[PDB]
């Protein structure tokens, strides 16, 4: 179906303990492929997928150089922002950056984005039109003005509508076995007493890829969000994912309740009664 | 592949 290539960047300052920690992570869809950590041994961008080790020395020298550049702009950004808000020299602050592109099922450009955060709230983001910036407060207005110097229009566009889509396409053929698979969720249902009048119905999905899945509760037609307890979709560690949803049931009525699972790996959407 | 241009904040 649709695909994505995303890079996530975290910078955290360490007042009186040196240079900020810097962490960069690459993803195609939900599969991680590269990493850099400013604390690790190598001081290089490192492979985290089988299919990307086949890139030559110049890729790795390239990516290493570019992420070292990324680290450096973030170092300066921590000091700029500490200046921008007049915060004291003695607190740890966080900068997160995320960019990349979405392609459709034809592998053509669909959407590009570049998000920025300071201390966990939105700082500046790139609008859909890829020329213009949403700035959060007065201090980000100065960054907006700076980044709306005339020449940037071209640069943004060039990466997100061009290079990002070029290389995501390259990666998707390079690991066809890894990235272009759909893994169907293995469905499963477990029932317990929890109150001797009440029963907990927990609905399961193990071993699926990609992570986007929808579990919802329903009693003989009309749906439920009131008694619904979703957990976060969680990695199994083998490259597939796991998720559960639960409802607190007036017991004796676990016949007229169906779990409903939607996944793109599913042919038909799965319906599970408790039997 | 990473983006080879970035501008300070």
């Amino acid at each position, epitope marked *: 179906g649709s695909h994505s290539m995303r890079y996530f960047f975290t910078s955290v300052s360490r007042p009186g303990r040196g240079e900020p920690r810097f962490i960069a992570v690459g993803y195609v869809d939900d599969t991680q492929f590269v990493r850099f950590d400013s604390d690790a041994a190598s001081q290089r961008m490192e492979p985290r997928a089988p299919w990307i080790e086949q890139e030559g020395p110049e890729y790795w020298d390239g990516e290493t150089r570019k992420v*070292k*550049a990324h680290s450096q702009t973030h170092r300066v950004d921590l000091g700029t922002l500490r200046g921008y808000y007049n915060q004291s020299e003695a607190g740890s602050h966080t900068v997160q950056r995320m960019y990349g592109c979405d392609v459709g099922s034809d592998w053509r450009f669909l959407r590009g984005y570049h998000q920025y955060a300071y201390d966990g709230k939105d700082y500046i983001a790139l609008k859909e039109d890829l020329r213009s910036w949403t700035a959060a407060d007065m201090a980000a207005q100065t960054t907006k003005h700076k980044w709306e*110097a005339a020449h940037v229009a*071209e*640069q943004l566009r060039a*990466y997100l509508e061009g290079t990002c889509v070029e290389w995501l396409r390259r990666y998707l053929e390079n690991g066809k076995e890894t990235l272009q698979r759909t893994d169907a969720p293995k469905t499963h249902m477990t029932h317990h007493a929890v109150s001797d009048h009440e029963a907990t119905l927990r609905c399961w999905a193990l071993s699926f890829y990609p992570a986007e899945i929808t579990l919802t509760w329903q009693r003989d037609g009309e749906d439920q969000t009131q008694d619904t307890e979703l957990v976060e979709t969680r990695p199994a560690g083998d490259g597939t994912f796991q998720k559960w949803a639960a409802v607190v049931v007036p017991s004796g009525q676990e016949q007229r309740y169906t779990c409903h699972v939607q996944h793109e790996g599913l042919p038909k959407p799965l319906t599970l009664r408790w039997e | 592949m990473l983006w080879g*241009y970035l501008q300070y904040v």
Partner: T-cell receptor, first 116, second 110 residues
């Protein structure tokens, strides 16, 4: 706005002599390079500096010397002139991480002859 | 060798189209440039290109095909003052070296 400047345009030296070639840059660029250009080899990089205070060697660094004490100036020292350092020398400057048009701009050049 | 260029000297009459090809070898290259150099003078920048397709500025047209690793430059309707050597330049990023071709020497005959 005034761009990359470089003095002098022309120079004769005898073998042994030292000179420095000045280079300056109006535009707050972090990244400054020094090249030599020669009839059979094109542009060749001598030294370069990715920010103020820091510098490193290029493809042809031997015989040449460099410091970047301010972001504006990148002087090239030749501490003992050899006849094979007869060339055209071009200073050059580009933004680095500083933000601007990605373009590297060149200085007007210094034509140097080293004679025995 | 990193940037492969048209050796020269290429001879064109005035009014004609001069067409300079340039090939490079780093797959991850992201910024592409044309410089013009008059004999005795310094390389002056005339065209920057970043995305695939055509960019036109005046009588110049540069093209980019990242898929075949090729930067070109058409000079449409050649002036006498177009006589120079044209330097193809390629980079990967802010901190990556700017890789140069040897230059192709273009002569506009009157």
């Amino acid at each position: 706005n005034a761009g990359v400047t470089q003095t002098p345009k022309f120079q004769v030296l005898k073998t042994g002599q030292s000179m420095t070639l000045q280079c300056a840059q109006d535009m707050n660029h972090e990244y400054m390079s020094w090249y030599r250009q020669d009839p059979g080899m094109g542009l060749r990089l001598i030294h370069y500096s990715v920010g103020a205070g820091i510098t490193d060697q290029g493809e042809v660094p031997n015989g040449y010397n460099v410091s970047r004490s301010t972001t504006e100036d990148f002087p090239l020292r030749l501490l003992s002139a050899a006849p094979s350092q007869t060339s055209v020398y071009f200073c050059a400057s580009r933004p680095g991480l500083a933000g601007g048009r990605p373009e590297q701009y060149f200085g007007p050049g210094t034509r140097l002859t080293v004679t025995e | 060798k990193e940037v492969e260029q048209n050796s020269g000297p290429l001879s064109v009459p005035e009014g004609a189209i001069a067409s300079l090809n340039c090939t490079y070898s780093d797959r991850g290259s992201q910024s592409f440039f044309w410089y013009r150099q008059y004999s005795g003078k310094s390389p002056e920048l005339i065209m920057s290109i970043y995305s695939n397709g055509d960019k036109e500025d005046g009588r110049f047209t540069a093209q980019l095909n990242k898929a075949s690793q090729y930067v070109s430059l058409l000079i449409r309707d050649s002036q006498p003052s177009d006589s120079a050597t044209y330097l193809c330049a390629v980079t990967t990023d802010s901190w990556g070296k700017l890789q140069f071709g040897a230059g192709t020497q273009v002569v506009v005959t009157p």
